[model samples]
Target: HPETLVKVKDAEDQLGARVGYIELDLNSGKILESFRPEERFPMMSTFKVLLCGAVLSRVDAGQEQLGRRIHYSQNDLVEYSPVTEKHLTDGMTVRELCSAAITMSDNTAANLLLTTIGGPKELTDFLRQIGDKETRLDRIEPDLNEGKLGDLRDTTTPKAIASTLRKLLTGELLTLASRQQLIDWMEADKVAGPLLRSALPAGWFIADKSGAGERGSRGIIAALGPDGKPSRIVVIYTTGSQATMDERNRQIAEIGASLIKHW
Candidate 1:
C-alpha cells in the first residue's frame, strides 16, 4: 500500500494543496491507506449527506415519510439551485428535495431539507449519536453565500467522513431499506464532476457525493469490488490550493486513478 500512499502524496505535492484522505476496507472497517486523515476541512455541499441522514432517520423512526410535501415560497429560494431556480409554485416533496439536493447539489433544496429536519443542530446531534465526534454542521445553506460562516462553518475530518460512510454502508446507522435508498441517491448524483468518476475502470460501480469551495474540493466514494461488496471507501479533502481549478481537478483524477490501480 506504500505505492498507493506515494501516488497520493505525489498528487498532493504536485498540486501544492493541503490534502486529507482515507481509504477503508468497507467489510472489515480497516483503513487501507491515508494521508492527513484527521485534518478538518469545510464541508460545503458535502454536508447535505448528513442532512439526508437526519431526515431518513426520522423516516426510519416513523415520524416522517418521503412523500411528505413541503411548500417553498419566493422567500425560501436561494442561489445555485436548478430546482428552486425553476420557480415551481407547488414546491416539492421530501423525496424530490432529497433527490435535487444530492444529484444537483441544489442549494435551495438543501435549505428546505435542512429546515424540514429541524436545522443544523439536528444533524450535529445525529452525528454525535452515531459516534462521529469530529463532524459538525454549524450553518445553513444560505449562510454560505452570506459570508456568515465565521469560525463555525460545517466541517469534518477525512477519518470521520469515512467512518460515517462505513456505518451507512454496514447498516449501523440506518435500516436496510433506508441504507439502500441512501446509496441510490448517492449513485444518482449528476454533478459529481471529473475527479472520482473519470478515473474509474469500466464496469466498476461507485456511489459518491462531492462538494466544492473557494479553496478546493472534497468528496467520498464507495467503490464496489468484483464480489459485490462495498470494498473500498475513499475520502479526499483538498484546500488552500494555488492551482487553477482545472489543475486541481487533474491532480484529483490522478489520485483517483492511483487508488483504482493500487487499492
Candidate 2:
C-alpha cells in the first residue's frame, strides 16, 4: 500500500503540495493503500454526500417526499467565495433542491435540504446506525457568520469517507433503488471542478463528491463506475501547504488519474 503512497508522494513532491490518500477495492471491501488516511481534515462539501444519503434514506422510508415543495429564504443562506448569495425563495421541490446541492454544490439548496431532512444530528445518527463510525458529522450546515465554515466545521478521515461511499455503492446504506439514486446524484455533482472530476477518465461514470476549504482542507470520493464495476476509491486531504490551490489540485488529479489509468 505504501507503494501507492509512494506514487502519490512522488507526484505531490513534483507538484509541490502535501497530500494524503487511501484507496479501497469495492468488490472485496479492502483497503489497498493508505497514507495518513486516518488523519482528520475538513470534510467541506464532500460532507454533502452524507447529507444526500440521509435525505434519500428518509425519502425511501416514506418520511419525506421528494416532490414536496420547500421554500428558501435569504436567512438560510451561507456565504462563500464563488458561491451565490442571491435569495432562494422560489418554490422548489425536494428533488430539485437535492439535485442542486449535489450537481452544483449549491449552498442555499444544501441548507434548505438540511433543514427539511432534519439537520446534522439526523445525519450523524444515520451514520451510526449504518456502522460508519469514522464518518463523523459535527455541524449542521455551514453558517454564513463564520468565514469559510472553518470555525463551525471540523474534519473526517479519508478511510471513513471512502468506507461510507463504498457502503452506499453496495446498497448497504439504503434500498437498492435509493442506492442507485444516490449514485445518480453523485455523478451529477458540479462542484468537482478540479478534484476527482478532473482526475478520472472521461465517460467513466463517477459518483463523486469533493471538498475544498481554506488552509488546505480538501477530500475527493468516487463511489463506483458503470458496468457495476468498482473503481479505485481515492481520498486526498491536506492542512496548510505552501502550494497554490491549483498546484495542490493538479497534484491530486495527477495521483488519482495515474491510478485510474494504470491500475
Candidate 3:
C-alpha cells in the first residue's frame, strides 16, 4: 500500500489542489489504497448516481415505473443542458431522464428526475439508509442559477461515494435489472474524458460517473477486471486547483493508471 500511496500522492502533487482518492476491493470489501479518503468535497453532478439509485430503488420496490413520463415547461428548462437543447416536444420518460442526467450531466434532466423522486431529502434519506451518513443532497440543479452555490452545495466523501457504488454493484440497493440499468447508464457516459476510463486495460469494463465544478472535478469508476483479478472501485475528488481542466484531467488519468497497474 505504500507504493500506491506514493503514486497517488505524486499524482495529487501534480494537480496542485486538494485531492481525495480511495480504491476498494469489491470481493473482500477492503480498502486497498486511499489518500484523504474521508475529506468531504462537493459532488457536483456525481450526485446524480445517488439520485438515479434512489429512483431505481423505488422502481425495484414496485412503487415506480420507468415508463412514467414527465412533462417539462419553459420554467423547467435550465442553462448548461444538452437535454433542453434537443427541444423535445413530448417530454421525457423517467428512463430517458435518468440517462440524460447520468450520461450527459444534463442539469434540467437532473432536476426533473430529482423533483420526480420527491426532492433532495428523499435522496438524503436513501443515503442514510445505505449507511452513508456524510453524504447529502442539499439542493436541485436550478438552485445554482439562484446564486446559492457557496457553502450550501451538495457534498460527499470519496469513501462514501465508492461505498455507494459497491452497494449498487452488489445489488444491495436495487434489483438486478435496476442495477444493470444504472450500470448501463454509467457505461454510456460520454463526458468522462480521460479520467478512470483512460486507465482501463483491454478486456476490462468500467462503469463510471463524472462531475465538474467551478474549482475542480470529481469522479467514481467501478471496474470489472479481467480474468484472475478482482473488481475494484476508484473515487477521486479535487478542488481549488489553479491548473487548467486538461491538466487536472491528466493528473487524474495518471493516478488511475497507477492504481490499475499496481492494484
Candidate 4:
C-alpha cells in the first residue's frame, strides 16, 4: 500500500499534476485503496464503457438489437473517427459500434452509440439509475473531451466510477451475457493500455478502457486481477500534467505495479 503512495506522490511531483484513483475488491464491493476518491476528473473515452452498458440494457429489454446494421453519412464524421470514418459506406452493426467505441476509442463510434442509446443525457440517467449520482455526461463527443479545468460536464470521481463499474460489470445491472460482452470489449482494447499493462506481470487479466484528449488528460478504468476471473477494479486518472502521455501512462503503470505487489 505504501508503494502505491510513493508512486502517486512521485508522479504528482514529476508531472506537476494531480492523481486520483481507487482500487476496489469487486467481489465484496469493498475499497482496498484510494486517493482523492471524491475529486472530479474528466471521463474521456472511459465513459464509453458505461455508455455501452446502457446499450446492453436496452438490448436486454428487446428495445434494441445489436445485430442490426445502421449506416451513416460522411457529414456524421468527427475528429478521431478511425473506424467510423471507414464504415460510412457499409455502416456498422450495433455490436460493432460498441466494440469500436470501447476498444478503439473511436469518436464517431462513441457518438453513434450515444445515438443508439438516445444520447448523453440518457447515459447520465442510466448512471443515476445504477446508483451513481456524481458522474455526469452533459455533452457529446469532440466537445465532451474538451474537459475544462473547472467545468464538471463530462466528469467522474474515482470512487463513484469504481463503484458504478462494479455494479455494471459485477452486479445484476446487466444480464450475464451482456455483462460478459462488456468485459470482452474492454479486453480487446488496442488503443490505450500497453503502458499500464506493462507494469503488470504478463498473463494477468486486465480489461480496461483508456482516454486521451483535452489538455494533458490521460486515464483508465480497469478490472484487473490474476490470470482470468478478474475480481478487482482499478481506476486511475491523471490531470493537468505537463508531461508526455507516455509519462502519464507509465506513472499509472507504476501504480498498477504497486497494486499487484500489495496483492
Candidate 5:
C-alpha cells in the first residue's frame, strides 16, 4: 500500500545517511518530487499546526474569538517551560495561547487551545473535509503520554502533512485572511529544529512545523523567498536515530539547503 518513489543516490552519501522526501509546489498543485510521500511515521508535535488551523477556522466561522481571555494557573503549564509560565496569573488571551503553543511549543498552551477548539473530534472532521485523508490527528499528545500508543503507535504520512499545509496556505481550508494569519503564526514559530528555517537564508521567509518522538522525527517545511516567489514544501521522517537534537537539526538544514539550491 506504500512505497518509495525516488532514491537520491547522493542524498545519503553527502549527508552521511539515507534520507527520504516528498515535495510539492503549492502554487501549481504538483508533486515535484518524492521518495516515499505515503510512508507513515509518528507525528510528534507537528500536529499542533492542525489544532491551530481548527482554532482559526472556528474563528473565521464566528464560533470562537481569538481575543477571548482565560486565566492560566500553574497547572496550565507543561513541558518546554515557557516564559509565559512566569506570568500565568496575569491572564492570557486565545491569541497569546496560540502564540505560546506555536512559537514556544508550550504544551500547556496547546492543551488549553485544544480544549477551547472543541478537542480532536472537530479537528479530525476539518481534516477530512479538507482532503487530508491519510492524516489521523485524533490527539496531539502521544499515546505514550496517555498510555495508549502501546506497541503500534499513531502515525501520519508525508503527503498528508504537505497536503494539509498546502490547503492552509491556499485558503482551501479557511478564508484568505485566516490563511494569512496561519502563515504568519507559522513564520513566527519558535521551534528550532530539522525544518525550513534551520536551512534557508536568514532573510528567506519560511513557514514550517517539526515533529519529534521516541519513535522518530518528522517535519514539514515551506519556503517563499525573494527569488521570484517559488514555494517548495518538504516532508521527511526517520527512525533509529542516535544523533542528538543538534546533530539531527544540522542534517535537516543540509537537506533544506540542497533543495533550495536546486529547486
Candidate 6:
C-alpha cells in the first residue's frame, strides 16, 4: 500500500488540507484501504443519499408511498434549491423529491424529504436504526453543508459512511424496488459527479453524491463498478483548508483516479 500513501499524500498536498477516506469491496464486504478511517468530516449533501434511503425504508414497510404529493409554500424553499423551488406551485411526490435531492443536490428538495419523513433528527434516528453510531445529522440544508470546524452537527467517519452505504446498496437494507429507486437517484446525480466520475477509467459505472462549502470542505461518496470486477465503494472527505472548490475537486478527482491502482 506504499503507492496508496503516495497517492493520498499527493492529494493532500494538492488541496493543502487533511484527507479522510475509505474504500470497500462490496462483493467481498472487505475494506480495501483507508486513511483516518475513523475521523469525522462534514457530510454535506452526501447525507442526501441516506436521506432518500430513510424514506424508502418507510415505503418498504407500507407506511409511505412514492406517489404521495407533498405541497409546500415559497417559504419552504431554501438556498441551493434548483428543482424544488421551481415546483412550488404543483408540489412534488416523494419519488420526485428523492430524485431532485440526489440528482440535483436540491436543498429545498432535501428539506421537503426531511419534512416528509420527519426532520434532521429523525434522519439521525434512522442512521442509528441502520446501526451507524458515528454519523449525525443535526441541521437541514445550507446549515448542514456549513462543514464548520469541530462542529458535530452533520458529520461522519470515512469508514462509517462507506459501511452504511454498503448496506444500502449491497446489503438487504431495502426491498429491491426501494433500493433501486435510491440507486437511480444516485446514478442520476447532476451536481457532483462531473470531476470525480470523469476521473474513473472507462467501463466503470458510478452512483455518487458530492458536497462543498465552509472551511473549504468538499467530499464525495460513490458506488463504483469496475469493468467485470467486484463492485467497490469509495468515500473521500477533505476539511480545514483555504483552497478553492476547484482545487479541492481536482484533488478529489485525482484521489478517485488513484483508487483503482489498488486492484
Top-scoring candidate (TM-score): 4
User: Each model's TM-score?
Assistant: 0.91, 0.85, 0.90, 0.96, 0.83, 0.95
Residue 140, candidate 5: Cα error in Å is 3.9
RMSD of 5: 4.1
What is candidate 5's lDDT per residue for 45-101, written digit by digit as tens? 667777888888899899989899877687656666475576677877888877776
lDDT (tens digit, per residue) of candidate 3 on 1-263: 67667766776787777788888888676898888989877787888888899999989888888999888788778777887557457888899899998888899998888887888888899889988888888788845322122464577888988888889777557888998898889877485457876657766777778777776554455545666343887788787666888888877777777777775
Candidate 2: worst-modelled 10 consecutive residues by lDDT: 143-152
Count steric clashes of candidate 2: 1
Q: Considering TM-score, which of the candidate structures 5 and 6 is the better prediction for this target?
A: 6
lDDT of 4 at 228: 73
Per-residue accuracy of model 6 over 96-174 as CA lDDT, tens digit each: 9988989888899999999988899999999999899999999997888787767988999999999999888876799
Which candidate number has the best lDDT? Answer: 4
Candidate 6: C-alpha RMSD after superposition: 1.6
lDDT tens per residue, model 1, 135-239? 888777756422222354677888998888788767558898888888888877475468787656656777777777665544444545543345788887776
Candidate 1 segments exceeding 4 Å error: 142-152, 189-192, 221-223, 227-229
* C-alpha RMSD for every candidate: 2.3, 3.4, 2.6, 1.3, 4.1, 1.6
lDDT of 4 at 70: 83
Over 4 Å off in model 2, which ranges?
Answer: 1-3, 11-18, 80-87, 141-153, 189-192, 224-229
**Stretches of candidate 4 exceeding 4 Å from the true structure:** 189-192
Q: Which residue pairs collide in model 6, if any? A: none
